[PDB]
Amino acid sequence: MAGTALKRLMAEYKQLTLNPPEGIVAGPMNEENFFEWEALIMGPEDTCFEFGVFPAILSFPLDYPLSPPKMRFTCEMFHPNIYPDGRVCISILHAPGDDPMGYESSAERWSPVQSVEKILLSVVSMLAEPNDESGANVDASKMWRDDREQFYKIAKQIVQKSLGL
C-alpha cells in the first residue's frame, strides 16, 4: 500500500530537485502527504501550447509504483488524448489492458512505473506533437483531424486562459 510508493516518490523528488527537466515544474502538496503533487506544464516552444503554463495535480495511489497514478489539469485544457473533463487520459499513463474503443495493447503502456520525469516529458511530447490516442476528447480529436487551424487557435486560447485571459 504505502512505503515503497512514498520512497519511489522521494526518489522522484530528489532527482527532480537535483536535475530539473525543462518544461516541468512539480512538487508534492505538503511534504507529509506525498501522494499528491502539483505541476506546471510549460508548453513546448515552437508549438501552439508554448507560452501556456498549464497547472495540474497528480494523485498517487496506494498501489504505486505498481499501478499508474492519476493526473488532472486544474485550469482545464483541450486535447484529444485528454478527457473533456480535464482529466489526463494519455497512452503511457494507461494500464496494459485498459485500452478501449478499438486499438490494441501493442502500443506503449504502463511500464515498471517509468518515472514522473519520463511521464511528464511524454506529456510534453503530446503537446508539441498532438497525438489522438483513443480520442478521449472526441470533439478535440475531431477538430484536430478536420481543421487543424481550429485546433491551433483553441490551443492558443487555452494558453492565454492558463495565463489568465
Is 75 considered catalytic here?
no
Provide the experimental method for this PDB entry. NMR
- Per DSSP, 75 falls in state T
- Alpha-carbon distance of 92 to 109, in angstroms, equals 5
Q: For residues 82 and 94, is the Cβ–Cβ distance under 8 A?
A: no
Q: Which residues span the domain enclosing 33?
A: 1-165
**Could you tell me the three cell numbers for 21?**
527537466
Q: Catalytic: which of 71, 82, 89, 155?
A: 89
Place of cell 530528489: 14
Angle at 45 between CA 44 and CA 47, to 5 degrees: 75
| E strand or H helix at 38 | strand 36-42
CATH of the domain at 99: 3.10.110.10
How many domains is the chain built from?
1
Q: How many helices (H) and strands (E) in the chain?
A: 4, 4
User: Which one-letter DSSP state was computed for residue 121?
Assistant: H
